[PDB]
Amino acid sequence: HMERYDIAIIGSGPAGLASAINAKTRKSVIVFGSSDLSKKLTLAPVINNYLGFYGIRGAELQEKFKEHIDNMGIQIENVKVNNIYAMGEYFSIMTSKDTYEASKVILAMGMEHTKPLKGEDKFLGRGVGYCATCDAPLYKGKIVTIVGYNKEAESEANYLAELASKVYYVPRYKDEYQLVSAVEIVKDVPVEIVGDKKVEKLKLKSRELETDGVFVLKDSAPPEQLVPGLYVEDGHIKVNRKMETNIDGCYAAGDCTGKPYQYMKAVGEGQVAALNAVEKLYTK
Amino acid sequence: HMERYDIAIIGSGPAGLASAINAKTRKSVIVFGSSDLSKKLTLAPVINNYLGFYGIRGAELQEKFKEHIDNMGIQIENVKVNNIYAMGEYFSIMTSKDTYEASKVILAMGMEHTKPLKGEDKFLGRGVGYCATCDAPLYKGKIVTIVGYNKEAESEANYLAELASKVYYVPRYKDEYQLVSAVEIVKDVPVEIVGDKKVEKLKLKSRELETDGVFVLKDSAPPEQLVPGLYVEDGHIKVNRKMETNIDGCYAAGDCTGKPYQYMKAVGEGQVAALNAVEKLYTK
Ligand SMILES: Cc1cc2nc3c(=O)[nH]c(=O)nc-3n(C[C@H](O)[C@H](O)[C@H](O)COP(=O)(O)OP(=O)(O)OC[C@H]3O[C@@H](n4cnc5c(N)ncnc54)[C@H](O)[C@@H]3O)c2cc1C
Ligand SMILES: Cc1cc2nc3c(=O)[nH]c(=O)nc-3n(C[C@H](O)[C@H](O)[C@H](O)COP(=O)(O)OP(=O)(O)OC[C@H]3O[C@@H](n4cnc5c(N)ncnc54)[C@H](O)[C@@H]3O)c2cc1C
């Protein structure tokens, strides 16, 4: 069904966990993200600029962070947040599973490193989107191509196969893929989304797919799509010294706020966002 | 004599150490402060909001920070910084011992918690000051009272006893005091600095001292006195998202920049300041 919380934290990396441990000062808090917290932490080899942990390996620091949240009774809700609608005094939070409401939101999604595909921006809203399940009814009986950058994208492909006339899945990571037989896996490199007034084809290095929709599925939609009305410049969510965005009650912390992309900056921002959000909840 | 460095960090607490470990990316760096890093860290009992160190004691976290800087060959220069003069393209740094020049400065002095004495602001520049050794020639053959909040203040009293006709030392901490016999220790509580056009007396709870100067000696002068021309509001050094102050080449990080006074905020700010300072050194 629906569940209400005082604070929702969108991301489970350094920034979101820093927010969570500072918000547990009560005030219900929910943290959305991945079971493994942050993929970048796991991939980091030796870390020498996180003060107090000289020479730690990324996966070791990840475990220290996991034990911290576990000691404080903080769990990660393992769902993808698709859209956050600023209703004015609260936020409606749409996810890959259930819908939530929260009084305050802390954006902590990190920063996407991969570039958009050619034609992606051009056809946005004319056949390109960032949430396949959200737009699924629009593609009933149509051809849909999903360019998947994470495992959740596979679930969206499976769902779309129940409505679309044909589903192609283009993986952008190496794994076994848990897809129903109706999904055609296209192990090729996307080149360009093309069309006249709307999407007509996805061109790949060795193949072209006639398709009505192309969904580009990453850990998070671009922030201005995830949070309609949010002020972003240069792909960075713009915040002030209190980590406040342009949307009252919506904060942002970590790589999603701009450079430098470092752990200490991220945890500091998460702390500031959470303490300010809590203050606003007690002052109304 | 004088020594030149690319970056000078003013403070050895969480913020300054975070700056130091991020600036050692070369670029000579000098860190001014106390041997014990930060007094607040030592006094902190259990810390649960420093991500990755759940349940750590303050002195334990202090030791982790000490081992980090030691592993990176970062030493603390154990002197008090008295004044930083923005010369335009560099900074002249006056200390309780030698003078330094630095291309970039990172202010990391923390935030003073004790309030000013009554009359302190009123007589500033008319008998009240924050550096006794700096103003010592002005008090040759005059009466000087030092209200000392740290051990360095004792050294300043000893120096002033060579020039002033009479030196009183009013300690604001419990310890043995290493003072020459010419210094009179006044174990009483300051109440008010009084005078007409200039300082004439220090009133204490049980005694009044006729005095020509009153020096209030804390770990650092107020930031607008430490750094002439620095923009401060509400006792907080005002910085932007890059930790830049109003003075080009001068950054600030940690409690000295405003609330919340927390460790994660401080280390994040120190990191941002240092990485920006380094960038400016490589771009000129
Ligand atoms: C190989 C490598 C080495 C690095 N080494 C260092 C180093 O030595 N020192 C250093 O300071 N920095 C280092 N970094 C950078 C550092 O990892 C980042 O600055 C830091 O991880 C930022 O954390 P964050 O919480 O802002 O974002 P992230 O760490 O990206 O966390 C984001 C998390 O939120 C989840 N999420 C995002 N959007 C949504 C959504 N819509 N719904 C649900 N969940 C979502 C993601 O799945 C992810 O788990 C390194 C990065 C890499 C890639
Ligand atoms: C009892 C107590 C418990 C606390 N518990 C927590 C907690 O659980 N979690 C949390 O997040 N925060 C806590 N805090 C607050 C936290 O300690 C501060 O936010 C943090 O120490 C800020 O560090 P900083 O580097 O900005 O300043 P500081 O820690 O004050 O470091 C300043 C250092 O620079 C030196 N210095 C200053 N001026 C000069 C100068 N002119 N020349 C030379 N050296 C100078 C000082 O001697 C000092 O050593 C606590 C504070 C106290 C007092």
Side-chain angles (χ1 to χ4, degrees), chain A residues 2-3 5-24 28-34 36-38 40-96 98-112 114 116-196 198-200 202-204 206-283, chain B residues 2-3 5-24 28-34 36-38 40-96 98-112 114 116-196 198-200 202-204 206-283:
Chain A
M2 190 167 303
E3 307 177 2
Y5 291 87
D6 296 311
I7 302 165
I9 296 164
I10 318 303
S12 54
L17 302 186
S19 290
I21 67 172
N22 281 279
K24 290 220 73 173
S28 53
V29 180
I30 180 159
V31 186
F32 298 100
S34 174
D36 62 359
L37 306 189
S38 176
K40 308 184 179 187
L41 273 167
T42 303
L43 292 177
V46 59
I47 301 161
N48 298 322
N49 68 350
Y50 193 87
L51 185 63
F53 286 113
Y54 177 82
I56 195 164
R57 305 152 72 168
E60 287 176 334
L61 185 60
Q62 182 207 5
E63 177 60 24
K64 302 272 192 205
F65 288 179
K66 184 52 162 47
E67 294 190 21
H68 201 317
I69 61 171
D70 291 351
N71 274 126
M72 296 183 78
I74 292 166
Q75 295 83 32
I76 304 313
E77 190 71 26
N78 187 45
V79 300
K80 178 179 181 185
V81 177
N82 289 319
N83 287 108
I84 300 169
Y85 296 116
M87 300 311 185
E89 268 79 335
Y90 66 105
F91 301 85
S92 189
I93 299 171
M94 309 295 121
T95 81
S96 54
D98 293 324
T99 296
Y100 303 78
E101 282 177 11
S103 298
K104 309 293 177 183
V105 168
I106 301 173
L107 303 177
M109 295 86 67
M111 175 67 66
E112 179 60 40
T114 63
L117 298 176
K118 187 178 183 182
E120 188 181 308
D121 280 324
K122 171 187 291 175
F123 291 99
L124 183 58
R126 307 187 170 87
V128 171
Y130 297 111
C131 186
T133 57
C134 307
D135 294 354
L138 203 51
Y139 294 92
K140 184 181 171 177
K142 299 191 173 173
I143 302 168
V144 175
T145 298
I146 290 168
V147 186
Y149 295 78
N150 59 24
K151 296 295 293 181
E152 195 275 340
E154 300 175 11
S155 299
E156 297 199 41
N158 292 333
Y159 181 75
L160 262 293
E162 308 287 329
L163 292 173
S165 54
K166 172 73 173 181
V167 180
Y168 299 104
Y169 189 77
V170 184
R172 312 302 298 122
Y173 54 93
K174 311 278 196 176
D175 198 5
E176 301 301 337
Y177 313 113
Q178 288 78 51
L179 298 165
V180 300
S181 56
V183 174
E184 180 177 340
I185 303 171
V186 177
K187 286 195 192 182
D188 199 337
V189 178
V191 183
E192 181 186 8
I193 301 155
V194 300
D196 191 335
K198 69 182 196 307
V199 171
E200 300 178 39
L202 175 62
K203 290 184 186 294
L204 304 99
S206 296
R207 178 170 188 183
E208 294 182 351
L209 300 180
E210 274 196 325
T211 192
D212 301 296
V214 174
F215 293 98
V216 170
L217 301 188
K218 296 180 186 182
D219 284 357
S220 178
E224 66 272 21
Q225 303 303 323
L226 176 75
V227 190
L230 181 67
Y231 174 60
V232 178
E233 176 177 44
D234 303 332
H236 313 301
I237 303 171
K238 291 288 179 182
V239 299
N240 68 11
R241 286 272 297 158
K242 292 180 180 261
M243 305 304 143
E244 292 167 343
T245 73
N246 68 314
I247 295 172
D248 186 50
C250 184
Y251 302 80
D255 286 358
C256 76
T257 74
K259 288 183 181 62
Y261 303 128
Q262 299 285 249
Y263 302 120
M264 295 208 296
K265 175 181 99 67
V267 299
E269 290 187 353
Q271 174 166 64
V272 174
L275 294 178
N276 272 303
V278 167
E279 182 184 15
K280 292 288 210 203
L281 283 166
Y282 280 111
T283 62
Chain B
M2 190 167 303
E3 307 177 2
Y5 291 87
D6 296 311
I7 302 165
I9 296 164
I10 318 303
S12 54
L17 302 186
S19 290
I21 67 172
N22 281 279
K24 290 220 73 173
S28 53
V29 180
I30 180 159
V31 186
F32 298 100
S34 174
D36 62 359
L37 306 189
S38 176
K40 308 184 179 187
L41 273 167
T42 303
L43 292 177
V46 59
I47 301 161
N48 298 322
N49 68 350
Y50 193 87
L51 185 63
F53 286 113
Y54 177 82
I56 195 164
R57 305 152 72 168
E60 287 176 334
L61 185 60
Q62 182 207 5
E63 177 60 24
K64 302 272 192 205
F65 288 179
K66 184 52 162 47
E67 294 190 21
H68 201 317
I69 61 171
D70 291 351
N71 274 126
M72 296 183 78
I74 292 166
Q75 295 83 32
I76 304 313
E77 190 71 26
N78 187 45
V79 300
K80 178 179 181 185
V81 177
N82 289 319
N83 287 108
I84 300 169
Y85 296 116
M87 300 311 185
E89 268 79 335
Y90 66 105
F91 301 85
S92 189
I93 299 171
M94 309 295 121
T95 81
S96 54
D98 293 324
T99 296
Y100 303 78
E101 282 177 11
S103 298
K104 309 293 177 183
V105 168
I106 301 173
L107 303 177
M109 295 86 67
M111 175 67 66
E112 179 60 40
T114 63
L117 298 176
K118 187 178 183 182
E120 188 181 308
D121 280 324
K122 171 187 291 175
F123 291 99
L124 183 58
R126 307 187 170 87
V128 171
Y130 297 111
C131 186
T133 57
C134 307
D135 294 354
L138 203 51
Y139 294 92
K140 184 181 171 177
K142 299 191 173 173
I143 302 168
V144 175
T145 298
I146 290 168
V147 186
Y149 295 78
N150 59 24
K151 296 295 293 181
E152 195 275 340
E154 300 175 11
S155 299
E156 297 199 41
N158 292 333
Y159 181 75
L160 262 293
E162 308 287 329
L163 292 173
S165 54
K166 172 73 173 181
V167 180
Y168 299 104
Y169 189 77
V170 184
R172 312 302 298 122
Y173 54 93
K174 311 278 196 176
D175 198 5
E176 301 301 337
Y177 313 113
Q178 288 78 51
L179 298 165
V180 300
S181 56
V183 174
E184 180 177 340
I185 303 171
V186 177
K187 286 195 192 182
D188 199 337
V189 178
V191 183
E192 181 186 8
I193 301 155
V194 300
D196 191 335
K198 69 182 196 307
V199 171
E200 300 178 39
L202 175 62
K203 290 184 186 294
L204 304 99
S206 296
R207 178 170 188 183
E208 294 182 351
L209 300 180
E210 274 196 325
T211 192
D212 301 296
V214 174
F215 293 98
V216 170
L217 301 188
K218 296 180 186 182
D219 284 357
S220 178
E224 66 272 21
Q225 303 303 323
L226 176 75
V227 190
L230 181 67
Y231 174 60
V232 178
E233 176 177 44
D234 303 332
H236 313 301
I237 303 171
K238 291 288 179 182
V239 299
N240 68 11
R241 286 272 297 158
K242 292 180 180 261
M243 305 304 143
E244 292 167 343
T245 73
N246 68 314
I247 295 172
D248 186 50
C250 184
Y251 302 80
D255 286 358
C256 76
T257 74
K259 288 183 181 62
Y261 303 128
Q262 299 285 249
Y263 302 120
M264 295 208 296
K265 175 181 99 67
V267 299
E269 290 187 353
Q271 174 166 64
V272 174
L275 294 178
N276 272 303
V278 167
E279 182 184 15
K280 292 288 210 203
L281 283 166
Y282 280 111
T283 62

